[PDB]
Amino acid sequence: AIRKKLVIVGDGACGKTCLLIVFSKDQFPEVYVPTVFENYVADIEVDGKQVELALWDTAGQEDYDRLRPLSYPDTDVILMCFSIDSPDSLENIPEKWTPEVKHFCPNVPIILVGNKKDLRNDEHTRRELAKMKQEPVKPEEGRDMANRIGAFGYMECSAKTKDGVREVFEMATRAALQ
């Protein structure tokens, strides 16, 4: 098995910690959802190739511009997250997260991931967003941002229901192998 490293980046409320927890346990915890994620080394077999994929979170580092880049050395694939219930988290992608990841991880594939896709058809989410003249992120808005920033690809998932979670990490493993 070859060793690859994955780092997840994005705003504080983007759901990156929950995404790593659900994938590493293969379950949305029924009793207690952890506040933080330390690290994990996933055994993944994608398209016949065995990989040990080390997983890292940047949660807690958002306000610390000199500590945060220490998470980037030798990264093989970046998951750049935004929350579908937060159009504001998508607007921070092109001119905050994107130039940072391109500077510290040149030539590293970036997969733009729209998290919490289950909230796109949640009435409480639609009501709350409508108060600020907003709506949940549309699939084409996510694809267009991914196209614009030079992302390897665009994907959506729900850590709550596990839908799309396995596919994101299998695709990230394939990107890391290229």
Place this chain on the structure above:
Amino acid sequence: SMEMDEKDFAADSWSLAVDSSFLQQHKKEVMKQQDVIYELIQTELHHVRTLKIMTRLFRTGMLEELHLEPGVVQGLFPCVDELSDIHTRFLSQLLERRRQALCPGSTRNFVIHRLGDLLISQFSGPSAEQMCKTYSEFCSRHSKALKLYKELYARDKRFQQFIRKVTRPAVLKRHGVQECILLVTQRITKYPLLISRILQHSHGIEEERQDLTTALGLVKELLSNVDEGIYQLEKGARLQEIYNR
């Protein structure tokens, strides 16, 4: 880690660690508060364990089995003894607070009502100055440690055999040399996340809500100071590159 502490923190949560007949006696808000306090102590126990792997398995193993040039082991594991001292003392305080709170006749049933004061003490005065000085030095030497590791693994046969030997067991899967260094660097930025969530469930006693709000402020001040004191060291960097920063 020692077996006693491992067993006390083996469950995924405080609600699964205590007896179900003890859990049933508490309100939902107390269970939510205790589950996050348990996570803080459990992750601190794991972080002290990461520092023991760095000091006893890697550092001491290299000094006792390998013939590395002087100052090479220090470059791979900067400040590890100082870091181990700070966190082992902090862990001792957290575990003693839990131990004092146990019900008579029980080694697992407890409720920690007064964490705030312990966190204010840890994140103020001399212990805070020592944490700021140590992480500013460690985090500025992080990139240098990783590059020194990569050079040694690629060019030194006995070093590569040593690494492959001591990292082969399944319990070391997440704890290679580079993984330990990043786990330590990321530890300090986990504290505000854990403290804010404990605070969210600590409104029942106003003194406790105030103490946790003060501790949260102190941790953030510490992080801002460490962040402002970092400049990555680079082996062979010239003075001209440094003063033209």
